[PDB]
């Protein structure tokens, strides 16, 4: 019953591959629904065409800033930044999907995909999903990041949506 969504990733406009995610709606429904709706575009805005603006090899890939494309923007489907739903799920290794934020109760649309175990984030960022298929595509994305997070090629969500 947990929704599945996909990203089709491109690198300087060239197709790279598809990453799919299981969203833990059974455990974090508000946070999963936000990401699901942004991935279908059904509210009139969302992740299609946006980029991964910060990628640190061995750490995480961060994206979801579809309004300012650099980490300063993005917005939820709720008309305002929303609360940390819970911290039930932990950052237990590669593939974990977790919300970026600006401190307690400031969730918008930015998210990151862990490429390692990042337990120091537990209790600070809401974990709400995990890569289901295509972890190898995230690993190929990671190689275009750098120590300070700047990417050497433009990584983009060329398409996205909900699978069934």
PDB file of C-alpha atoms in Angstrom, residues 6-157:
ATOM      1  CA  UNK A   6      10.355   7.235  -9.868  1.00  0.00           C
ATOM      2  CA  UNK A   7      12.884   9.790 -11.069  1.00  0.00           C
ATOM      3  CA  UNK A   8      14.290   9.646 -14.594  1.00  0.00           C
ATOM      4  CA  UNK A   9      17.745  11.241 -14.212  1.00  0.00           C
ATOM      5  CA  UNK A  10      19.734  13.074 -16.891  1.00  0.00           C
ATOM      6  CA  UNK A  11      23.337  14.322 -16.893  1.00  0.00           C
ATOM      7  CA  UNK A  12      23.972  17.395 -19.069  1.00  0.00           C
ATOM      8  CA  UNK A  13      20.715  16.533 -20.810  1.00  0.00           C
ATOM      9  CA  UNK A  14      21.699  12.942 -21.609  1.00  0.00           C
ATOM     10  CA  UNK A  15      19.645  10.087 -20.095  1.00  0.00           C
ATOM     11  CA  UNK A  16      21.315   8.241 -17.231  1.00  0.00           C
ATOM     12  CA  UNK A  17      18.597   6.013 -15.782  1.00  0.00           C
ATOM     13  CA  UNK A  18      15.666   5.601 -13.404  1.00  0.00           C
ATOM     14  CA  UNK A  19      15.619   5.583  -9.594  1.00  0.00           C
ATOM     15  CA  UNK A  20      12.482   4.376  -7.856  1.00  0.00           C
ATOM     16  CA  UNK A  21      11.539   4.895  -4.210  1.00  0.00           C
ATOM     17  CA  UNK A  22       9.229   3.299  -1.689  1.00  0.00           C
ATOM     18  CA  UNK A  23       7.586   6.048   0.381  1.00  0.00           C
ATOM     19  CA  UNK A  24       6.768   5.097   3.981  1.00  0.00           C
ATOM     20  CA  UNK A  25       3.202   6.414   4.052  1.00  0.00           C
ATOM     21  CA  UNK A  26       2.315   3.817   6.705  1.00  0.00           C
ATOM     22  CA  UNK A  27       4.754   5.534   9.104  1.00  0.00           C
ATOM     23  CA  UNK A  28       5.074   9.166   7.911  1.00  0.00           C
ATOM     24  CA  UNK A  29       1.938   9.902   5.848  1.00  0.00           C
ATOM     25  CA  UNK A  30       2.188  13.684   5.664  1.00  0.00           C
ATOM     26  CA  UNK A  31       5.804  13.636   4.601  1.00  0.00           C
ATOM     27  CA  UNK A  32       5.336  10.794   2.122  1.00  0.00           C
ATOM     28  CA  UNK A  33       2.275  12.484   0.589  1.00  0.00           C
ATOM     29  CA  UNK A  34       4.206  15.735   0.087  1.00  0.00           C
ATOM     30  CA  UNK A  35       6.946  13.945  -1.860  1.00  0.00           C
ATOM     31  CA  UNK A  36       4.443  11.805  -3.801  1.00  0.00           C
ATOM     32  CA  UNK A  37       2.430  14.841  -4.937  1.00  0.00           C
ATOM     33  CA  UNK A  38       5.539  16.817  -5.897  1.00  0.00           C
ATOM     34  CA  UNK A  39       6.692  13.792  -7.923  1.00  0.00           C
ATOM     35  CA  UNK A  40       3.410  13.568  -9.874  1.00  0.00           C
ATOM     36  CA  UNK A  41       3.070  17.324 -10.351  1.00  0.00           C
ATOM     37  CA  UNK A  42      -0.638  17.085  -9.534  1.00  0.00           C
ATOM     38  CA  UNK A  43      -0.714  20.394  -7.596  1.00  0.00           C
ATOM     39  CA  UNK A  44       0.729  22.327 -10.566  1.00  0.00           C
ATOM     40  CA  UNK A  45       4.335  22.327  -9.341  1.00  0.00           C
ATOM     41  CA  UNK A  46       6.890  19.742  -8.333  1.00  0.00           C
ATOM     42  CA  UNK A  47      10.163  18.025  -9.094  1.00  0.00           C
ATOM     43  CA  UNK A  48       9.965  17.589 -12.880  1.00  0.00           C
ATOM     44  CA  UNK A  49      12.824  19.505 -14.482  1.00  0.00           C
ATOM     45  CA  UNK A  50      14.574  20.304 -11.200  1.00  0.00           C
ATOM     46  CA  UNK A  51      18.192  19.503 -10.399  1.00  0.00           C
ATOM     47  CA  UNK A  52      20.335  17.860  -7.753  1.00  0.00           C
ATOM     48  CA  UNK A  53      22.288  20.927  -6.687  1.00  0.00           C
ATOM     49  CA  UNK A  54      24.495  19.461  -3.921  1.00  0.00           C
ATOM     50  CA  UNK A  55      26.244  16.091  -4.166  1.00  0.00           C
ATOM     51  CA  UNK A  56      28.974  14.987  -1.761  1.00  0.00           C
ATOM     52  CA  UNK A  57      30.551  11.629  -2.645  1.00  0.00           C
ATOM     53  CA  UNK A  58      30.332   9.134   0.176  1.00  0.00           C
ATOM     54  CA  UNK A  59      27.685  11.292   1.896  1.00  0.00           C
ATOM     55  CA  UNK A  60      24.470  12.189   0.035  1.00  0.00           C
ATOM     56  CA  UNK A  61      22.798  13.654  -3.058  1.00  0.00           C
ATOM     57  CA  UNK A  62      20.486  16.610  -2.344  1.00  0.00           C
ATOM     58  CA  UNK A  63      17.753  17.984  -4.580  1.00  0.00           C
ATOM     59  CA  UNK A  64      14.183  19.218  -4.651  1.00  0.00           C
ATOM     60  CA  UNK A  65      14.789  22.980  -4.857  1.00  0.00           C
ATOM     61  CA  UNK A  66      12.510  23.474  -7.843  1.00  0.00           C
ATOM     62  CA  UNK A  67      12.030  27.223  -7.308  1.00  0.00           C
ATOM     63  CA  UNK A  68      15.610  28.540  -6.877  1.00  0.00           C
ATOM     64  CA  UNK A  69      17.711  25.561  -8.107  1.00  0.00           C
ATOM     65  CA  UNK A  70      20.461  26.125  -5.533  1.00  0.00           C
ATOM     66  CA  UNK A  71      19.293  25.104  -2.049  1.00  0.00           C
ATOM     67  CA  UNK A  72      17.605  28.372  -1.042  1.00  0.00           C
ATOM     68  CA  UNK A  73      14.134  27.587  -2.386  1.00  0.00           C
ATOM     69  CA  UNK A  74      11.433  24.960  -2.751  1.00  0.00           C
ATOM     70  CA  UNK A  75       8.009  24.687  -1.168  1.00  0.00           C
ATOM     71  CA  UNK A  76       5.715  22.000   0.229  1.00  0.00           C
ATOM     72  CA  UNK A  77       2.209  21.201  -0.988  1.00  0.00           C
ATOM     73  CA  UNK A  78       0.750  22.634   2.236  1.00  0.00           C
ATOM     74  CA  UNK A  79       1.118  26.382   1.587  1.00  0.00           C
ATOM     75  CA  UNK A  80       3.878  26.728   4.202  1.00  0.00           C
ATOM     76  CA  UNK A  81       6.841  24.804   5.536  1.00  0.00           C
ATOM     77  CA  UNK A  82       5.587  21.917   7.675  1.00  0.00           C
ATOM     78  CA  UNK A  83       6.449  20.107  10.893  1.00  0.00           C
ATOM     79  CA  UNK A  84       8.795  17.197  11.501  1.00  0.00           C
ATOM     80  CA  UNK A  85       6.236  14.412  11.421  1.00  0.00           C
ATOM     81  CA  UNK A  86       8.234  11.943  13.536  1.00  0.00           C
ATOM     82  CA  UNK A  87      11.721  10.477  13.784  1.00  0.00           C
ATOM     83  CA  UNK A  88      10.692   6.803  13.844  1.00  0.00           C
ATOM     84  CA  UNK A  89      12.886   5.857  10.885  1.00  0.00           C
ATOM     85  CA  UNK A  90      16.655   6.171  11.143  1.00  0.00           C
ATOM     86  CA  UNK A  91      19.465   6.946   8.691  1.00  0.00           C
ATOM     87  CA  UNK A  92      20.669   3.341   8.458  1.00  0.00           C
ATOM     88  CA  UNK A  93      22.644   3.313   5.193  1.00  0.00           C
ATOM     89  CA  UNK A  94      22.735   3.952   1.438  1.00  0.00           C
ATOM     90  CA  UNK A  95      19.400   4.591  -0.248  1.00  0.00           C
ATOM     91  CA  UNK A  96      17.626   6.260   2.685  1.00  0.00           C
ATOM     92  CA  UNK A  97      15.440   9.165   1.512  1.00  0.00           C
ATOM     93  CA  UNK A  98      15.208  12.008   4.054  1.00  0.00           C
ATOM     94  CA  UNK A  99      13.935  15.593   4.272  1.00  0.00           C
ATOM     95  CA  UNK A 100      16.300  18.530   4.152  1.00  0.00           C
ATOM     96  CA  UNK A 101      15.360  21.449   6.379  1.00  0.00           C
ATOM     97  CA  UNK A 102      16.473  24.714   7.995  1.00  0.00           C
ATOM     98  CA  UNK A 103      16.028  23.620  11.594  1.00  0.00           C
ATOM     99  CA  UNK A 104      13.121  22.112  13.523  1.00  0.00           C
ATOM    100  CA  UNK A 105       9.755  22.116  11.718  1.00  0.00           C
ATOM    101  CA  UNK A 106      10.891  23.715   8.438  1.00  0.00           C
ATOM    102  CA  UNK A 107      10.216  20.999   5.840  1.00  0.00           C
ATOM    103  CA  UNK A 108       9.558  22.216   2.311  1.00  0.00           C
ATOM    104  CA  UNK A 109      10.428  20.232  -0.818  1.00  0.00           C
ATOM    105  CA  UNK A 110      14.178  19.627  -0.526  1.00  0.00           C
ATOM    106  CA  UNK A 111      15.294  16.064   0.179  1.00  0.00           C
ATOM    107  CA  UNK A 112      18.453  14.010   0.086  1.00  0.00           C
ATOM    108  CA  UNK A 113      19.402  10.447  -0.791  1.00  0.00           C
ATOM    109  CA  UNK A 114      22.023   8.975   1.527  1.00  0.00           C
ATOM    110  CA  UNK A 115      24.918   7.084  -0.048  1.00  0.00           C
ATOM    111  CA  UNK A 116      26.198   5.878   3.334  1.00  0.00           C
ATOM    112  CA  UNK A 117      25.035   5.493   6.920  1.00  0.00           C
ATOM    113  CA  UNK A 118      24.514   8.995   8.368  1.00  0.00           C
ATOM    114  CA  UNK A 119      23.375   8.333  11.940  1.00  0.00           C
ATOM    115  CA  UNK A 120      24.301  11.851  13.100  1.00  0.00           C
ATOM    116  CA  UNK A 121      21.212  13.065  11.204  1.00  0.00           C
ATOM    117  CA  UNK A 122      18.854  10.917  13.300  1.00  0.00           C
ATOM    118  CA  UNK A 123      16.314  13.068  15.100  1.00  0.00           C
ATOM    119  CA  UNK A 124      17.122  16.105  12.930  1.00  0.00           C
ATOM    120  CA  UNK A 125      15.825  15.030   9.502  1.00  0.00           C
ATOM    121  CA  UNK A 126      12.649  13.028   8.855  1.00  0.00           C
ATOM    122  CA  UNK A 127      13.319   9.751   7.027  1.00  0.00           C
ATOM    123  CA  UNK A 128      10.367   8.900   4.824  1.00  0.00           C
ATOM    124  CA  UNK A 129      11.453   6.541   2.053  1.00  0.00           C
ATOM    125  CA  UNK A 130      14.143   4.399   0.531  1.00  0.00           C
ATOM    126  CA  UNK A 131      15.500   3.644  -2.922  1.00  0.00           C
ATOM    127  CA  UNK A 132      13.767   0.516  -4.243  1.00  0.00           C
ATOM    128  CA  UNK A 133      15.422   0.136  -7.652  1.00  0.00           C
ATOM    129  CA  UNK A 134      18.225   2.051  -9.306  1.00  0.00           C
ATOM    130  CA  UNK A 135      20.673   2.549  -6.445  1.00  0.00           C
ATOM    131  CA  UNK A 136      23.311   2.109  -9.164  1.00  0.00           C
ATOM    132  CA  UNK A 137      21.956   5.253 -10.843  1.00  0.00           C
ATOM    133  CA  UNK A 138      22.388   7.193  -7.593  1.00  0.00           C
ATOM    134  CA  UNK A 139      25.967   5.863  -7.451  1.00  0.00           C
ATOM    135  CA  UNK A 140      26.602   7.118 -10.976  1.00  0.00           C
ATOM    136  CA  UNK A 141      25.137  10.519  -9.980  1.00  0.00           C
ATOM    137  CA  UNK A 142      27.408  10.672  -6.934  1.00  0.00           C
ATOM    138  CA  UNK A 143      30.517  10.612  -9.121  1.00  0.00           C
ATOM    139  CA  UNK A 144      29.612  14.037 -10.522  1.00  0.00           C
ATOM    140  CA  UNK A 145      29.709  15.634  -7.078  1.00  0.00           C
ATOM    141  CA  UNK A 146      32.666  17.056  -5.229  1.00  0.00           C
ATOM    142  CA  UNK A 147      34.044  17.720  -1.767  1.00  0.00           C
ATOM    143  CA  UNK A 148      32.174  21.029  -1.404  1.00  0.00           C
ATOM    144  CA  UNK A 149      29.019  19.690  -3.080  1.00  0.00           C
ATOM    145  CA  UNK A 150      29.308  21.465  -6.433  1.00  0.00           C
ATOM    146  CA  UNK A 151      28.438  19.155  -9.321  1.00  0.00           C
ATOM    147  CA  UNK A 152      30.673  18.863 -12.394  1.00  0.00           C
ATOM    148  CA  UNK A 153      27.714  18.118 -14.683  1.00  0.00           C
ATOM    149  CA  UNK A 154      24.105  19.324 -14.380  1.00  0.00           C
ATOM    150  CA  UNK A 155      22.092  16.493 -12.780  1.00  0.00           C
ATOM    151  CA  UNK A 156      18.372  16.781 -13.531  1.00  0.00           C
ATOM    152  CA  UNK A 157      15.081  15.004 -12.892  1.00  0.00           C
TER     153      UNK A 157
END
